[PDB]
Amino acid sequence: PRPRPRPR
Amino acid sequence: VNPTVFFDIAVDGEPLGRVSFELFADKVPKTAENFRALSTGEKGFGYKGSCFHRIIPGFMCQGGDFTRHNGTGGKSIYGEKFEDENFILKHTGPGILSMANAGPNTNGSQFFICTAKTEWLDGKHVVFGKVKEGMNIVEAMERFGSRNGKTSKKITIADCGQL
């Protein structure tokens, strides 16, 4: 699970 | 004239404050209309009573999952999903309102409010509005987020509609 939006 | 919508935010049921938004119907009319209609509940469903399930301080506050309350649900006024309308508008700074998605042409009801410039999201998420009043209330909501986005208190849209 890597929900968007993704951070930077 | 671009529409204005508001959300009244509560924390564990305690009123926190109101956030209003300008919706850029002049540039993204289809996407602005979905958000506007979900805010008014005019189609018989929408944001009222839904929660901000993912809050990452210094990045964004995410909500709009009114069906599953955890990032895996939501739906638009057009169907379960609709296309990325355009990427005219960019993620320029705090207050930008933009669509969350699960890849291209997967917009439903989930949205995020930036609390920083997030330019890496340009051309991947549809920008459709900004905060107009109550950015301080969005800033207060970050008090209940975490690096991984799990909230430490229940953050809800107690009321919403059009101004």
Numbering used by the authors:
A (entry chain B): 1 to 8
B (entry chain A): 2 to 164
Give excerpts from the publication.
PPIA is a major cellular chaperone that catalyzes cis/trans isomerization of prolyl peptide bonds and thus helps proteins to fold when they exit from the ribosome. The most frequent cause of familial forms of these diseases is a hexanucleotide repeat expansion in the non-coding region of the C9ORF72 gene that is translated into dipeptide repeat polymers. We demonstrate that proline/arginine repeat polymers inhibit the folding catalyst activity of PPIA, an abundant molecular chaperone and prolyl isomerase in the brain that is altered in amyotrophic lateral sclerosis. X-ray crystallography determines the atomic structure of a proline/arginine repeat polymer in complex with the prolyl isomerase and defines the molecular basis for the specificity of disease-associated proline/arginine polymer interactions.
The structure of the PR20/PPIA complex was resolved at 1.3 Å resolution. In the heterodimeric complex, four PR repeats are in direct contact with the catalytic pocket of the enzyme. The functionally important PPIA-residue Arg55 forms hydrogen bonds with the carbonyl group of a proline–arginine peptide bond. The proline residue in this specific peptide bond has a cis conformation, suggesting isomerase activity of PPIA on the PR repeat polymer. In addition, several other intermolecular contacts are present in the structure of the complex: Trp121 forms a hydrogen bond with the carbonyl group of the adjacent arginine–proline peptide bond; Asn102 and Glu120 of PPIA form hydrogen bonds with the arginine side chains of the PR repeat polymer. The chaperone-bound PR polymer chain displays a continuous electron density without interruption throughout the crystal lattice. However, the electron density of a single asymmetric crystal unit can only accommodate four PR dipeptides. Always four PR dipeptides from the polymer bind in an identical manner (residues I to I + 7 in Fig. 3b) to the respective PPIA molecule in each asymmetric unit. Due to the continuous electron density of the PR chain in the crystal lattice, the PR repeats are randomly positioned, i.e. no unique start of the polymer chain is present. This suggests that the chaperone can bind to any of the PR dipeptides in the repeat polymer and the electron density is a result of this averaging process.
